[PDB]
């Protein structure tokens, strides 16, 4: 048994009839770890699984929940999220003997611009944090860039920043899935957003799309 290669979340906040099984992005270089930026309504109810149609709930004795976001997570069968908000839903699925051990973490919605367009910030600095929208269909909005170069964007977790980084590719959010050393152009030029002073990024994480203005 090795760690799972896929992970999905299903629940009321994605579709009121639980028809949407949202695939999670793999954390780069960390087998069995996954992340997804999701809006949870107040009292949302959900489960997750390693494959579509597999339901794992909060009762499962393989599951531990860590709240680092003030989400408020309880329940009998379904996970229940008390406080409405955007959260980074994070799953670590390790192997323990012949079974999985799952650690579910709720991180706060902290998205950052990194790199040359910020004048060289490669640190978590709230000057470069995106503004968070109030609603499920809203946009995260970056501060204005102050210099030219390739955009880098990421979520904040406990790991190195670039384990959970992403870009835009023809207007779609694309999560890093390779050993990116220096530039997105190592995958292709259409992955590299060239920013200039005054440009702004807008991201719609429910639709999976974004733009540079």
Ligand X SMILES: OC[C@H]1O[C@H](O[C@H]2[C@H](O)[C@@H](O)[C@@H](O[C@H]3[C@H](O)[C@@H](O)[C@@H](O[C@H]4[C@H](O)[C@@H](O)[C@@H](O[C@H]5[C@H](O)[C@@H](O)[C@@H](O[C@H]6[C@H](O)[C@@H](O)[C@@H](O[C@H]7[C@H](O)[C@@H](O)[C@@H](O)O[C@@H]7CO)O[C@@H]6CO)O[C@@H]5CO)O[C@@H]4CO)O[C@@H]3CO)O[C@@H]2CO)[C@H](O)[C@@H](O)[C@@H]1O
Name the site residues for ligand X (rule: CB under 6 A). 122, 162, 179-182
The annotation status of 179 as a binding-site residue, yes or no, is yes
What DSSP string describes 85-148?
A: EEEEEEEEEEEETTEEEEEEEEEE--EEEEBGGGTSB-S--GGGBPBPPSSTT--EEPPPP-S-
Residue 181 annotated in ligand binding: yes
Neighbours of 28 (CB within 10 A): 18
In the bound state with ligand X, the residue whose beta carbon lies nearer, of 135 and 185, is 185
- Indicate the residue among 17 and 158 with the shorter CB distance to ligand X: 158
- State which residue has the least CB distance to ligand X: 122
CB of 144 to ligand X, least distance (A): 21
* Closer CB to ligand X, 137 or 186, in the complex: 186
Question: Would the annotation count 184 as a binding residue?
Answer: no
Residue 52 Cβ vs ligand X, minimum distance, rounded to whole Å: 30
Is 176 annotated as ligand-binding? yes
The HSE-up count of residue 172 (CA atoms within 13 Å, CB side) is 6
Rounded-to-integer distance, Cα 134 and Cα 155, Å: 18
In terms of Cα–Cα distance, which of 147, 153, 146 is closest to 124?
153
Question: Shortest Cβ distance from residue 205 to ligand X (Å)?
Answer: 22
**Nearer residue to ligand X within complex by CB, 98 or 182:** 182
* Dihedral sign, Cα of residue 67, residue 127, residue 212, residue 151: negative
152 is in an annotated binding site: yes
Q: Which residues are annotated as a binding site for D-glucose?
A: 152, 161, 176-181
């Amino acid at each position: 048994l090795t760690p799972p290669k896929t992970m999905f979340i299903v629940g009321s906040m994605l579709d009121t009839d639980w028809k949407v099984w949202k695939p999670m992005a793999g954390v780069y270089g960390m087998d069995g770890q996954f992340y997804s930026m999701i809006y949870f309504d107040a009292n949302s109810e959900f489960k997750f699984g390693t494959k579509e149609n597999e339901y794992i709930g909060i009762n499962d004795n393989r599951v531990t929940v860590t709240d680092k976001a003030g989400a408020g997570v309880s329940g009998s069968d379904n996970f229940v999220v008390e406080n409405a908000g955007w959260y980074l839903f994070y799953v670590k699925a390790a192997v323990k003997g012949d079974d999985y051990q799952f650690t579910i973490t709720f991180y706060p919605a902290e998205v950052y611009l990194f790199g040359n367009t910020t004048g060289g910030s490669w640190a978590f600095n709230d000057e470069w944090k995106f503004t968070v929208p109030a609603t499920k269909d809203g946009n995260f909005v970056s501060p204005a860039m102050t210099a030219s170069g390739e955009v880098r964007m990421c979520f904040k977790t406990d790991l190195d920043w670039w384990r959970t980084e992403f870009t835009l590719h023809d207007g779609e959010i694309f999560y890093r899935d390779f050993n990116l050393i220096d530039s997105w152009t190592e995958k292709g030029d259409g992955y590299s957003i060239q920013g200039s002073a005054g440009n702004v990024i807008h991201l719609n994480f429910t639709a999976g799309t974004g733009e540079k203005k």
